[PDB]
Design an enzyme around this catalytic site. Structure first.
Site, PDB file in Angstrom:
ATOM      1  N   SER A   1      13.013 -36.513  -7.109  1.00  0.00           N
ATOM      2  CA  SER A   1      13.448 -37.892  -7.233  1.00  0.00           C
ATOM      3  C   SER A   1      14.979 -37.944  -7.472  1.00  0.00           C
ATOM      4  CB  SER A   1      12.552 -38.532  -8.311  1.00  0.00           C
ATOM      5  OG  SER A   1      12.518 -39.928  -8.189  1.00  0.00           O
TER       6      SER A   1
ATOM      7  N   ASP B   1       5.152 -42.669  -0.094  1.00  0.00           N
ATOM      8  CA  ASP B   1       6.007 -42.750  -1.287  1.00  0.00           C
ATOM      9  C   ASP B   1       6.467 -44.205  -1.426  1.00  0.00           C
ATOM     10  OD1 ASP B   1       8.125 -42.632  -3.176  1.00  0.00           O
ATOM     11  OD2 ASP B   1       8.488 -40.530  -2.641  1.00  0.00           O
TER      12      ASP B   1
ATOM     13  N   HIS C   1       4.923 -40.888  -4.664  1.00  0.00           N
ATOM     14  CA  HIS C   1       6.166 -40.379  -5.239  1.00  0.00           C
ATOM     15  C   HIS C   1       5.980 -39.181  -6.177  1.00  0.00           C
ATOM     16  CE1 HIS C   1      10.390 -40.383  -5.960  1.00  0.00           C
ATOM     17  NE2 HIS C   1      10.260 -40.581  -7.278  1.00  0.00           N
TER      18      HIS C   1
END
Lengths: 277, 277, 277
Positions: free
Chosen positions: A98, A228, A257
């Site tokens: 991320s 995602d 995600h």
């Protein structure tokens, strides 16, 4: 002294450093608004296999100092550099998730790819999340402004709503939510600084990493879920794997995600294969 | 080290200090059994406007040391003074919520109003909560004895029941409880010391602040909800505002005890207007 | 520095030390995967009676360092000795719960019963949990391998499932579960290291204390629930009380593993009686 380093600017950075001193090193960089605890499934897998793993908490996150300023990618990279310099772990494989994938790319650009053998960007923010006149497929800025307004209005509730909904795909048909996973996300977010996390949204969503990516010639693996809901696949992982000089994309079909948790076994197997390559 | 100071009696006090070093300062003092995290909504508001904000964890609360003794207003005031001494923030506006408003009053009386420009008492315990033959309108001591018994019997359950019920008025019809708010309150309580918090009940409920209040001549703003189920409005804020020399009461109609969270936007605007006055 | 000691091998151990400096001391040793917070009900009871209580967090648990290695009873014992050495509390009564009872036994064996006036093993792992040729009625090793696999798979969820099910007997008909108790168990577990806890399963289940127990000549009290789903009563407390030279067993009929919490008033009374004997 075990597990803390103080940066040049007086910020205490917490880190985990596990495994044999002379083993190959993997250094992990976590996402917003979490901590090094978000890598637990990977850290355990690798240390149990005899590797050395390092994972630190970003400034204002987790157990690191709640410093009010410097919440940008240049500081995040330099704080990572303070951990590497203390431990002597130059040459490690660096893995980001991320926001942490942005931090990895900026660390390489700022401190040199000579110090990184291989990099992995999992579900990562590069090249640029926000929509601009020259990034018309990006996410409108108002989306991020609204995340900031939620943090300001009721951080405690927002940090349940994100993991209960979009982050792990628990809002999708067929999902099997884990209450422990949700509360664990929340617990990590809440121990961090509201100010660091509030500014942190701009850092992850509005930093352009395109130039940094193009300077990377070391082997890069990009892993990304094609469902995602937090960092859209088409405008992140797909682009990053092509912008770096020597990149490869692994797409996890249907995945959300939070793939270090939801697809830990795949992530672990893919990271190990890449490390041994 | 950033965000800690060791008092002269060996207690490590955790604090947040955010914002430009030369800006006007607001120092915030939290309630029982919480931590400086209870001010997050305010700290963020003020730092984003360019002010400097300081907020510390009471001894035996939050991230401060679990010292077994000195759980009384004099020591609480002296621990605050240690933070102000380290940071050089004399002349700040001091803002207390709940037990923290008692701490602010005792800090002013014990360390001198010359060191505080303005004070704000939000939902605060003064002048004297407990019923005595000479405070016949107070709350019967049995009530506080029962709080202590609940802390001793099952603190983990008590610290869900208080925020889920009286603290935020989530027990009122039509209220919209926030799970995240409830769990955040709990999280802050449980990290503190059971002994500090047990003794702390006596500190907040049985200390008489009447003489301290009568000696305060600096400007004082009192904010109090008229539906406060934890610190009864008529026997606290209404009286404190009249006892100080230069006091003003703002009443939040319908508001519960936890107004820094439930009425954040009003608190922030009132605090800002007073700071600038 | 109040509440931390650094071991010879560089591990920071967190401890609580409450009560008058000259009073009789009781030192408490917590179970897996928790912390010294698991003793809240006992620490408060004894400090309110004017005793001195000490309770430390095991390496990689609670607030102690997340060191990757030395997760075995010899190091647990040595870490406990570090706390006793710093405080000068030799001669204390030592009380262990669960894994902590093993730690008390190995501490006595390694550091000498001369330093311990009396010992108490509550719901404790000795003499040896796992099945072996000389422990034919023990628990099959596969049961512990499966715990380790749960920790590796989803520690966050496993740490809700244990306290919600077997640990407090909340899975029994007519049981009254406490959400606070469940979340507090979880909270303590998750702040610790997944690696320390994964290795710790071996340390608690797969360490033979038989010869340690046979060497103990000081007064020993064993307290154990006969409906204990975590450490089976017949292969643990019943045996430990007979192997030590001067041992007594108190059986709590119908009681689960988590008796410091569920049977707090009984535990507190039996500990106080033994302490004064």
């Amino acid at each position: 002294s075990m597990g803390t380093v103080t940066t040049k600017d007086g910020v205490e950075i917490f880190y985990k450093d596990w495994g044999p001193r002379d083993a190959k090193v993997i250094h992990f960089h976590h996402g917003w608004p979490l901590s090094s605890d978000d890598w637990d499934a990977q850290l355990l897998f690798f240390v149990n296999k005899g590797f050395r793993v390092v994972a630190h908490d970003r400034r204002g996150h987790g157990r690191s100092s709640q410093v009010w300023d410097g919440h940008d990618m240049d500081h995040y990279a330099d704080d990572a550099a303070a951990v590497v310099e203390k431990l002597g772990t130059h040459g490690a494989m660096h893995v980001g998730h991320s926001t942490g994938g942005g931090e990895v790319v900026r660390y390489i650009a700022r401190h040199g790819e000579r110090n990184v053998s291989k990099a992995v960007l999992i579900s990562s923010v590069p090249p640029l999340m926000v929509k601009t006149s020259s990034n018309p497929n990006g996410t409108p800025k108002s989306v991020f402004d609204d995340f900031q307004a939620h943090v300001a209005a009721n951080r405690a509730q927002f940090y349940l709503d994100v993991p209960a909904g979009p982050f792990y795909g628990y809002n999708r048909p067929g999902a099997k939510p884990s209450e422990g996973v949700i509360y664990n996300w929340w617990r990590q977010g809440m121990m961090g600084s509201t100010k660091a996390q509030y500014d942190g949204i701009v850092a992850f969503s509005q930093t352009d990493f395109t130039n940094d990516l193009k300077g990377i010639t070391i082997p890069v693996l990009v892993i990304h879920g094609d469902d995602d809901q937090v960092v859209p696949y088409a405008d992140s992982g797909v682009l990053s794997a092509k912008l770096v000089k020597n990149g490869k994309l692994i797409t996890y079909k249907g995945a959300p995600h939070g793939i270090p948790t939801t697809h830990a076994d795949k992530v672990n197997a893919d990271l190990l294969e890449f490390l041994q390559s």
